[PDB]
């Protein structure tokens, strides 16, 4: 895999955000994970978490997995990097996501973030808690 440029337009939530990809504006939706909603328990914490981790960044990277790039509404599907460091890592590793929406041909990065939940909910974090 192989990461590519973007910029942040705006955050959304803990695992979508419009980000500026080839010129173009798009919503993102991070590959493997799910957070909760806003509206719903640590939904907040993790749209905080996200927004933070975008915000903060001086370069944004997004990487595309090996199968679809688009999902049925249209938001790319990709990890994305703030810094060099993963998001959808972050998220899972402080329990704020959990790892899920695993399709065969978009699991890359599948064991790394399994490795990072089993340590967020041995600590017991957010989610796990
Ligand atoms: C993460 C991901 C979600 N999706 C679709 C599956 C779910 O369909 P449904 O909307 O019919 O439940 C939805 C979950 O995204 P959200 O968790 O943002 O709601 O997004 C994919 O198709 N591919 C993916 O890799
Ligand atoms: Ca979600």
Request: cysteine-free; aromatic content about 18%.
């Given at each position: 895999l192989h990461k590519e440029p973007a910029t942040l337009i705006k955050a959304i939530d803990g695992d979508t955000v419009k980000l500026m990809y080839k010129g173009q504006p798009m919503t993102f939706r991070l590959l493997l994970v799910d957070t909760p909603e806003f509206?719903?328990?640590?939904g907040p914490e993790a749209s905080a978490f996200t927004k933070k981790m975008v915000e903060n960044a001086k370069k944004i990277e997004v990487e595309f997995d090996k199968?679809?790039?688009?999902?049925?509404?249209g938001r790319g599907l990709a990890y994305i990097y703030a810094d060099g460091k993963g998001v959808n890592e972050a998220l899972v590793r402080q329990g704020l996501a959990k790892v899920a929406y695993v399709y065969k041909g978009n699991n890359t990065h599948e064991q790394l973030l399994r490795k990072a939940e089993a340590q967020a909910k041995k600590e017991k974090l957010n989610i796990w808690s």
């Open positions: 509206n719903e328990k640590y199968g679809q790039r688009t999902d049925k509404y």
